Amino acid sequence: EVQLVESGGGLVQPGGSLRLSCAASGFYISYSSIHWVRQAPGKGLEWVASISPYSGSTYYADSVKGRFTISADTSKNTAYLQMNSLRAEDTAVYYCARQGYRRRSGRGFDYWGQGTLVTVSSASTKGPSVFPLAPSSKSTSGGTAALGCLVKDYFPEPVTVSWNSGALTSGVHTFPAVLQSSGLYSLSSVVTVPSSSLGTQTYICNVNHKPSNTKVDKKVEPKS
Amino acid sequence: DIQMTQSPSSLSASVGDRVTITCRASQSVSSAVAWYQQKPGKAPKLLIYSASSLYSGVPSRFSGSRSGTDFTLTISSLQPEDFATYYCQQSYSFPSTFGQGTKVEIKRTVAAPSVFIFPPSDEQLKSGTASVVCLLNNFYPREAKVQWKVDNALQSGNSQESVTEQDSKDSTYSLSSTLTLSKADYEKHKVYACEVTHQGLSSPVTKSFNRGE
RNA sequence: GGUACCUACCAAUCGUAGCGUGUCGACCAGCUGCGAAACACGCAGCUGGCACUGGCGCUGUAGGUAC
Ligand SMILES: CN(CCO)c1ccc(/C=C(\C#N)c2ccc(C#N)cc2)cc1
Ligand SMILES: [Mg+2]
Ligand SMILES: [Mg+2]
Ligand code: NA
Minimal-distance CA residue of chain B relative to A130 = B124
Q: How far apart are the first and last CA of chain A?
A: 57
CATH number of A3-120: 2.60.40.10
Nearest nt to the B92 alpha carbon by C1'? C38
Contact B104, B84 (CB under 8 A): yes
Query: Edge to edge, what strands does the sheet with A203-209 contain?
Result: A159-163, A203-209, A214-220
Ligand 4 centroid distance, CA of B162 (Å) = 74
Query: DSSP letter at A105?
Result: H
Secondary structure element (H or E) that encloses residue A102, with its range: helix A102-105
Contact across the interface for A138 and B176, Cβ inside 8 Å: no
In chain B, the domains with their CATH numbers are 4-106 (2.60.40.10), 114-210 (2.60.40.10)
Measured distance CA(A191)–CA(A172) in Å, rounded: 4
> B183 at the A interface (CB within 8 A)?
no
Contact across the interface for B163 and A175, Cβ inside 8 Å: yes
Q: Report the residue from A113, A138, A173 with minimal CB separation from B43.
A: A113
A129-220: same fold as A3-120?
Answer: yes
Q: What is the CA radius of gyration of chain A?
A: 22
Measured distance CA(A105)–CA(A2) in Å, rounded: 15
Secondary structure element (H or E) that encloses residue A104, with its range: helix A102-105
Q: Report the residue from A47, A108, A152 with minimal CB separation from B55.
A: A108
Peptide linkage before B120 cis (omega within 30 of 0): no
**Closest Cα to residue A29, out of A97, A81, A82, A95?**
A97
Contact across the interface for B120 and A131, Cβ inside 8 Å: yes
E runs forming strands in chain B = 4-7, 10-13, 19-25, 33-38, 45-49, 53-54, 62-67, 70-75, 84-90, 97-98, 102-106, 114-118, 129-139, 145-150, 153-154, 159-163, 173-182, 191-197, 205-210
Q: How far is residue A90 CA from its own chain's centroid?
A: 15
Estimate in Å the CA B147 to C1' C9 gap, whole number.
110
Ligand 4 centroid distance, CA of B98 (Å) = 46
Q: Which nucleotides on strand C sit less than 7 A from a protein beta carbon? A: 34-41
CA distances from A13 to A90, A177, B52, B98 (A): 11, 21, 43, 28
Contact across the interface for A112 and B44, Cβ inside 8 Å: yes
Contact across the interface for A180 and B160, Cβ inside 8 Å: yes
Contact across the interface for A173 and B164, Cβ inside 8 Å: yes
Interface of A with B in 28-67 (CB under 8 A): 35, 37, 44-47, 50, 59-62
- Which residues fall inside 7 Å of strand C, measured at CB? A 27-28, 31-33, 50, 52-55, 57, 99, 101-103, 107; B 32, 91-94, 96
Contact B51, B71 (CB under 8 A): yes
DSSP for B5-16, written as a single string: EEE-SEEEE-TT
Q: Report the residue from A47, A61, A178 with minimal CB separation from B160.
A: A178
Query: DSSP letter at A138?
Result: S
Q: Where do runs of H (alpha helix) occur along chain B?
A: 122-125, 183-187
> A158 at the B interface (CB within 8 A)?
no
Measured distance CA(A178)–CA(A130) in Å, rounded: 15
Give A110-113 contacts, CB < 8 A, sequence gap 24+. Answer: A110/A2, A110/B46, A110/B55, A111/A2, A111/A3, A111/A4, A112/A4, A112/B43, A112/B44, A112/B45, A113/A4, A113/A5, A113/A6, A113/A22, A113/B43
Minimal-distance CA residue of chain A relative to B45 = A110
β-strand pairing of B10-13 with B102-106: parallel
Angle made by CA atoms A64, A155, A186, in degrees to the nearest 5: 120
Nearest nt to the B90 alpha carbon by C1'? C38
3-state class of A198 per DSSP? coil
Secondary structure element (H or E) that encloses residue A103, with its range: helix A102-105
Contact across the interface for B50 and A175, Cβ inside 8 Å: no
Q: How far is residue A133 CA from its own chain's centroid?
A: 25
Contact across the interface for A178 and B55, Cβ inside 8 Å: no
β-strand pairing of A68-73 with A172-174: unpaired
Q: Where do runs of H (alpha helix) occur along B26-134?
A: 122-125
Domain boundaries, chain A: 3-120, 129-220
Ligand 3 centroid distance, CA of A186 (Å) = 82
What does this entry list as its resolution, in Å? 2.2
**In angstroms, what separates the C-alpha of B2 from chain A's closest C-alpha?**
12
Minimal-distance CA residue of chain B relative to A44 = B100
Neighbours of A8 (CB within 10 A): 16
3-state class of B42 per DSSP? coil
**In angstroms, what separates the C-alpha of A181 from chain B's closest C-alpha?**
10
Give the fold, CATH level 3, of A129-220.
Answer: Immunoglobulin-like (2.60.40)
Burial A206-224 (b: 16+ CB within 10 A, else e): bbbbebeebebebebeeee
